[PDB]
Design a protein around this ligand. Structure first.
Ligand SMILES: CNCc1ccncc1
Ligand SMILES: [Cl-]
Ligand SMILES: [Cl-]
Ligand SMILES: [Cl-]
Ligand SMILES: [Cl-]
Ligand SMILES: [Mn+2]
Length: 340
């Protein structure tokens, strides 16, 4: 039967089932006040699906200049055309190649650039903002969004949304690599998976995707969404409570030292955005520091709510289009305050 919600991560993660249910706030707010992330499924069904395809982005915007990142070695590919990224999104034999002759795993950097999303893509902007879940929190003028209401004593988020476009990681070696490394944001955010691209030509790597989710520490209820409902999995997240950020810094300082980095004892390895916590680092965090995280698989249409100050990392399983909006909830406004 249709139900209001369910639990993931063995009861530690709320999953809301209907993105436009006017009563969601009653379940949401209790979980949110405790510093937990929240998942809302089904947002894809509310969107105009023709607006969120890689072929449309290539056709409409393909002549713009951009930089890309090689996810495997963090190298920048400077001043290429945006079509060079999009035309390889699903067709592997069209991807830019590394010196070694392999197709590259690429991320499109800062596109649309800065705050231009609304000006460049006015129809996409309308379609996203009108269909965000928890609208009193997430809309620019929502009754519980303080972004437009705070003085300069608080860091205000840039006008959004922001897009995250990147290929899926492929090999066993790629399992230890991040699409986006561990970092934190001083505002809350909602991140929506608007498109998942399962490739062709080398499209058959369905079994390395299961070993990544399994080793990623994903829960048994999550593994059932694949095998039983045939939903398309985009990305594996790890999120940590804001209260655990300093223990995470202590671990990454210890590991930097062991790997012979030379860092001052105050340096911030989370702000550096230089680490991805692989299965080894996540076990060590748990055992040596007492810190447990939320391992989340974001499927097509899943909205991930990320609390202000919560460290998080993302590993694309397949090619993804994500769109995120920043907001400032009253629950987490401490995280953006400039004093004490
Ligand atoms: C896939 N999204 C990448 C991302 C970057 C920063 N924060 C959250 C997500
Ligand atoms: Cl548009
Ligand atoms: Cl709401
Ligand atoms: Cl990064
Ligand atoms: Cl908090
Ligand atoms: Mn982030």
């Amino acid at each position: 039967s249709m139900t209001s919600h369910s639990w993931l991560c063995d009861g530690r993660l709320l999953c809301l089932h209907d993105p436009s249910n006017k009563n969601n706030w009653k379940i949401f707010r209790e979980c949110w006040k405790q510093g937990q992330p929240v998942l809302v499924s089904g947002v894809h069904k509310k969107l105009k699906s023709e607006l969120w395809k890689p072929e449309a982005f290539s056709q409409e915007f393909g002549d713009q200049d951009v930089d890309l990142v090689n996810c495997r070695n963090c190298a920048i590919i400077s001043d290429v055309k945006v079509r060079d990224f999009w035309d390889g999104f699903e067709i592997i034999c069209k991807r830019l190649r590394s010196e070694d002759g392999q197709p590259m795993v690429l991320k499109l950097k800062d596109w649309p650039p800065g705050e231009d999303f609304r000006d460049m893509m006015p129809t996409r902007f309308e379609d996203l903002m009108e269909n965000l879940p928890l609208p009193e929190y997430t809309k620019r003028d929502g009754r519980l969004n303080l972004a437009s209401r705070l003085p300069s004593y608080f860091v205000r988020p840039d006008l959004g949304p922001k897009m995250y476009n990147a290929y899926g990681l492929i090999t066993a070696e790629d399992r230890r690599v991040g699409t986006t490394n561990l970092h934190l944001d001083v505002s809350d955010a909602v991140n929506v998976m608007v498109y998942v691209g399962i490739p062709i030509g080398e499209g058959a790597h369905d079994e390395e995707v299961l070993k990544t989710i399994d080793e990623g520490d994903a829960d048994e209820v999550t593994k059932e969404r694949i095998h039983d409902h045939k939903e398309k999995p985009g990305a594996l997240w790890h999120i940590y409570a804001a209260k655990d950020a300093e223990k995470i810094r202590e671990l990454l300082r210890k590991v930097g030292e062991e790997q012979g980095q030379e860092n001052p004892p105050d340096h911030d390895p989370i702000h550096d955005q230089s680490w991805y916590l692989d299965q080894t680092l996540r076990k060590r965090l748990y055992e040596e520091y007492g810190v447990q995280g939320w391992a989340i698989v974001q499927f097509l249409g899943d909205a991930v709510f990320i609390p202000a100050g919560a460290p998080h990392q993302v590993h694309n399983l397949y090619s993804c289009i994500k769109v995120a909006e920043d907001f400032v909830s009253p629950e987490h406004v401490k995280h953006c305050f400039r004093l004490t």
